[PDB]
Amino acid sequence: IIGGEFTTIENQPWFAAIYRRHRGGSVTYVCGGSLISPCWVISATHCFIDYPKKEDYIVYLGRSRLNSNTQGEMKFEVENLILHKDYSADTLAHHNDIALLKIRSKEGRCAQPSRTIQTIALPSMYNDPQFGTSCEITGFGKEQSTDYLYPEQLKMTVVKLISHRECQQPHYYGSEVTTKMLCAADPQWKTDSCQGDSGGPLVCSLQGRMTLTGIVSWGRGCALKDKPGVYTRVSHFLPWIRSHT
Ligand SMILES: COc1ncc(-c2nc(C(=O)NC(=N)N)c(N)nc2N)cn1
């Protein structure tokens, strides 16, 4: 997250921290995700595509720091890693960039809700807030494009929804962005998602309810003028999510 503020898991309790075990036993951060029901975490397919094997992954819920065990966290293995069969990657843009992780603990149980662990509601069909609505994004991604390290503390910020029309303009993304994608950005381009934020939540208030409107997918750089963050448009994937959960 470029700009924004540090936070703790209490403020974004559906946020899931996804890690991979390497050949040798070293464990590294991969991507964010979101808890959409006790047994199911939703994330982005591009995060896993180089390593499709579900035994390689560990998911934490209730975790506020990248490399320390937050008090109250839960740890899960991945019992079902569902990548979207229509996924594709161009030079920049990712299509159908959505993934589902079925989680189960070593004790064979799903998520138990707490002050640090909650689900996030899905939108209803094709129901998005209007452009200019403020939404929040959360993650452990880079704080500056040129950073090598990820921040050790969880971060969040606020971006505003941009219209498909505006995001289609030539100095934005042209035809790289489609109707199953949503654009969001800061008016001053001062805060954004970045590398390491992929798979994480874009959450908006809709009908006075917090709703998983987007999943961090891609962008050209981070916090660049005329280059919004691009998100998987969750309200356009509900059939796929229903059929797979
Ligand atoms: C040109 O170098 C470069 N490296 C990484 C990224 C990148 N960006 C976003 C991203 O959300 N960008 C954004 N919201 N502007 C992302 N999720 N993952 C990424 N790897 C972009 N550019």
What secondary structure, in 3-state letters, does the chain show? CECCEECCHHHCCCEEEEEEECCCCCEEEEEEEEEEECCEEEECHHHCCCCCCHHHEEEEECCCECCCCCCCCEEEEEEEEEECCCCEECCCCEECCCEEEEEECCCCCCCCCCCCCCCCECCCCCCCCCCCCEEEEEECCCCCCCCCCCCCECEEEEEEEECHHHHHCCCCCHHHCCCCEEEEECCCCCCECCCCCCCCEEEEEECCEEEEEEEEEECCCCCECCECEEEEEHHHCHHHHHHHC
* Ligand 1 atom index nearest CA of 197: 17
Go through the domains of the chain in sequence order and give each one's CATH number.
1-12+120-235 (no CATH), 13-119+236-245 (2.40.10.10)
What is the residue with the minimal CA distance to atom 18 of ligand 1?
A: 195
Cα of 242 vs centre of ligand 1, distance in Å, is 29
- 10 Å CB burial of residue 46 (0-12, 13-18, 19+) is buried
50 is catalytic: no
Among 143, 152, 157, 170, residue whose Cα is nearest residue 201: 157
What is the residue with the minimal CA distance to atom 19 of ligand 1?
A: 195
Q: How far apart are CA 121 and CA 240, in angstroms?
A: 16
Q: How far apart are CA 22 and CA 32, in angstroms?
A: 18
Task: Say if residues 55 and 221 touch (Cβ distance below 8 Å).
Answer: no
231, HSE (Cβ side, Cα atoms, 13 Å): 35
Tokens encoding 79: 């019992």
For 131-160, b/e burial (b = at least 16 CB within 10 A) is beeebbbbbbbbbeeeeeebbeebbbbebb
Q: How far apart are CA 229 and CA 162, in angstroms?
A: 10
CB neighbour list of residue 112: distance below 8 Å, 6 or more residues apart? 38, 74
For 75-86, b/e burial (b = at least 16 CB within 10 A) is ebbbeebbbbee
Catalytic residue among 198, 217, 235, 236: 198
> Which of 92, 148, 161, 194 is the pocket-test mutation for ligand 1 (most atoms within 8 Å of CB)?
194
- 10 Å CB burial of residue 39 (0-12, 13-18, 19+) is middle
145 is catalytic: no
Q: How far apart are CA 217 and CA 181, in angstroms?
A: 9
97 is catalytic: yes
Task: Say if residues 235 and 126 touch (Cβ distance below 8 Å).
Answer: yes
CB neighbour list of residue 44: distance below 8 Å, 6 or more residues apart? 31, 94, 97, 98, 99, 198, 199, 215, 216, 217, 232
| Number of residues assigned to the chain | 245
46, HSE (Cβ side, Cα atoms, 13 Å): 22
